[PDB]
Design a protein around this ligand. Structure first.
Ligand SMILES: [Ca+2]
Length: 119
C-alpha cells in the first residue's frame, strides 16, 4: 500500500523527505501520462505501468493492498508469504524505490503543470 511504498522510499532514500517524490514530473504521484521528463520520472512511469498491470489481478488494488516486506541494512525484500497480488505490488514498489535512489533529483521537475506538460 502507499504507506508501505512511502516507507520503502524512506529506507532507500533517507536523505530526502518522501513527499519529494509524491509530485514530480509527469508520472511521480498524481500523474500518469505524457513524456517522462527525466530519469526519475521514468522510474515513476515504470511504477505506474507496473500498478496498471497488477490491477488486472482480481481484487488487486495497489494503493491499498498490504503486502509483506522488510527494509533492513540497506536492502528491501518482498517476503514469501505474499499472494500473487501482494508479490506483484511489492515488486513494483521495491523496484521503484531502488530506481529512485539512483536517479538525480531535479527541483525544477517538482510539481510541474500536468495539464500543460503531460499530454
Ligand atoms: Ca503516478
Amino acid at each position: 500500500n502507499l504507506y508501505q511504498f512511502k516507507n520503502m522510499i524512506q529506507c532507500t532514500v533517507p536523505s530526502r523527505s518522501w513527499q519529494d517524490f509524491a509530485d514530480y514530473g509527469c508520472y511521480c504521484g498524481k500523474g500518469g501520462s505524457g513524456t517522462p521528463v527525466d530519469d526519475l520520472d521514468r522510474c515513476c512511469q515504470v511504477h505506474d505501468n507496473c500498478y496498471n498491470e497488477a490491477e488486472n489481478i482480481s481484487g488487486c488494488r495497489p494503493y491499498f493492498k498490504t503486502y509483506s516486506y522488510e527494509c533492513t541494512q540497506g536492502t528491501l525484500t518482498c517476503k514469501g508469504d505474499n499472494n500473487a497480488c501482494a508479490a506483484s505490488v511489492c515488486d513494483c514498489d521495491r523496484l521503484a524505490a531502488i530506481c529512485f535512489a539512483g536517479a538525480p533529483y531535479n527541483d525544477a521537475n517538482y510539481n510541474i503543470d500536468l495539464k500543460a506538460r503531460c499530454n
